[PDB]
Symmetry: none
Subunit: 318 residues, 3 copies
């Protein structure tokens, strides 16, 4: 871990924290919510020792990366803009892409805008967001799960920040990271709860030490949740602005991996999209879908070694 | 339908009924239990009109094909023996393979012994039976679900024939063809009763006409069930005899398609095998898995047009 | 649940409700306080499926089993008297033994008086009550935790009953069943109050359904708590009468399994007995201790499937 290099770079008008290790073809990791570059610690060290340069930034609004002030600075276009500028800084034409959760949505955008710059993509948790021309992203979510669906509850500016502050930062992080409840996260009215996890464990699972937890906590105490929450607040705008890619396909080779208990996999008709043919239709070079038994949302941490091999076994084919 | 040609051929020392229509590369269809060539009727008509020669035999012991007397005449080697002799009579080096249920197991054996004779394989319902070197096929089923699991109950000679004879042939065929109940079929002690289906309609689903059922019934009224049942009675022997191929891989390109409600998909940890990596490991050129929403076991009949397109879009790439 | 047989049998001069399903070697389940045969619902269905005869009575004083009027009818001897008469009616020489809480204490007496009739023992929550020749059971408890310790509070006849009548039976059952509080249950001075759970959830844990709680409530609204409380009111008498087995060992194979948050595990120095050598000293064929993380007292219900596998994997060896 002490061997991981840390630097700040200037990309797309912002300052970004970039963690890296190794030499070789770039493997670019994009973390999700509410995570950090640190979520990729095991993969950084693993792929580093296999002849690749591992590169994991904090995304815009996260950790030690600058958090622009206005909510409108968090469209997928801004965030891909940072990454394209980063890849140019790395001085390579193509990267291998590995991404998870919100990082995977951003990953999909990157593949949409610039498939030429991604050799292959290991996508965790979140399949491509199929753009339905008849209904906006968040609208479809609300129609299915109502106002207390977490993504709906994440919309109103300031409100979730306030609810999270009531229960405190450490509680929010522990609540989310340790959750194993499948299905749509629905919050209790007017407050946090018991947000994502009504059965919070006494002890932390073996994959998440208390030090690990402390790392996240120290970073989120500094930054708060507004930057990260702003990605969600732009989902309908993202839907609008991506009209040019309506009905299109992604030709980048893809390996998809989710935990069986991941709330993403177990909601939003995601199974039908993944296994029914839709996913393969949108993503013609999707080579393989893997469902990990008794693994939940944070599969790169909970199933770290399997994810390491799955990444290497795929990217070596190129 | 009356434009389909029907003939008897001599193959591997038996007389086999072959249904055929069209000219072009052979697409060879293999029905399962408790079915007939007739299950493929929509596929026969659809594929023959797309520039292919559709060939659907009744297998050994079914329909208008000879039924040997001995239980030991129904190992997978006997049945592939018939089919290899048949492909030879057709005068072709390769076939496209399409199969379902017991037909699919036989299709796997065919791809195991002569992958060269098979261009591509559309496999319905039943994935490769991975040979566990430590445990026999039927023993593993008994261990998981006990003696009343249907395949266990199918073992003792004469018993299921008798039990079926008491409820009647039509009832058996209707009971089985109409079922939509997921999970392992467990029979009631000492009788046929209701399983496979505790919730018979009894109005037939739209995909199965009373004329369809009548045709099935007239064949099984003639043949009884012993021939078909004997396939299951050789599963442990098939396991023993295939020791030369343990740890083997199948290199034939495969497209796997199952109804979501199929009892095969929803038992025996088949989901773990299909989605976990086991299937793709054994079958490296497994290009795609499709799980059909709200469709049960008999997917080629229930989702005919869907299946027709799925077959066509696959085999046209070769 | 409906395939479960329920009969009344005459054992040891009392009428006993017995719940039964499946066939094969007998597996006998002994429930604790304040439970029922119904606590074993998942284990009954699971194990009768794998070819065992699952048998689970309501113990004396519980549910639909007769409840003798006198306190003196509730020694361990009376209850093992019941169980031996039962195993005789079952017509086997040995049974497999699974027990939890007070049932486990009785089960220990059974193993003490007749190890010949027990092939192996799966013990949940309560280890062997070591007979300290120097001090009676409740005396030691009272020395350690004072008069408001729950077992001491259960001694004076009529008192806990009345405190439970105020506050009502549904509260008592929910309060006890939902508790996850480790350590010694210590009651408020003159009433039930919060007793067992100072922090009761508004919502049942996922393992307990409203139908579940209603079942318990129903029987306990009919029977009351006297019968079950009477077991505690004979702990000292049991200590006296077991003088003949002072210093003895127990040779029955035992698998012990506790939730790490069980009040039993986290009080009365149970940890030092279980892991310190003492439990192994008293029970030489104790194969392993299984502490289940993030599980509380009622482990057969909270980790139902996991315990199904634990039982099965153990009684396999025998």
């Amino acid at each position: 871990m002490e061997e991981i290099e840390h630097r700040t770079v200037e990309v797309n008008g912002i300052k970004m924290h970039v963690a890296e290790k190794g030499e070789g073809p770039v493997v670019l990791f994009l973390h999700g919510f509410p995570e950090l570059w640190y979520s990729w610690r095991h993969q950084i060290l693993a792929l580093s020792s296999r002849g690749y340069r591992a590169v994991a930034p904090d995304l815009r609004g996260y950790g030690d990366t600058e958090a622009p002030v206005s909510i409108s600075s968090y469209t997928g276009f801004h965030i891909v803009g940072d990454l394209i500028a980063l890849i140019d800084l790395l001085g390579v034409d193509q990267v291998f892409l590995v991404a998870h959760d919100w990082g995977a949505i951003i990953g999909w955008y990157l593949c949409t805008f610039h498939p030429d710059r991604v050799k292959a993509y290991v996508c965790l948790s979140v399949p491509l967001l199929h753009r339905d021309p008849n209904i906006r992203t968040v609208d479809a979510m609300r129609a299915m799960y109502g106002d207390d669906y977490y993504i709906c509850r994440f919309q109103k500016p300031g409100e979730m920040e306030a609810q999270m502050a009531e229960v405190g930062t450490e509680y929010v992080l522990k609540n989310i990271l340790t959750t194993r409840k499948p299905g749509p996260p629905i919050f209790p009215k007017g407050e946090y709860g018991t947000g994502f996890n009504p059965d919070m464990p006494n002890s932390l699972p073996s994959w998440l030490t208390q030090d690990d937890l402390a790392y996240y906590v120290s970073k989120y105490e500094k930054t708060g949740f507004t930057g990260p929450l702003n990605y969600y607040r732009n989902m309908n705008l993202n839907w609008e602005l991506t009209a040019p890619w309506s009905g299109g396909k992604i030709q980048v080779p893809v390996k998809f991996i989710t935990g069986e208990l991941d709330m993403v996999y177990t909601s939003l008709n995601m199974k039908e999209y993944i296994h029914g043919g839709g996913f393969k239709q949108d993503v013609p070079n999707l080579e393989e879908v893997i469902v990990q038994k008794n693994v939940a949302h944070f599969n790169n941490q909970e199933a770290a070694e399997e994810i390491n091999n799955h990444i290497y076994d795929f990217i070596k084919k190129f």
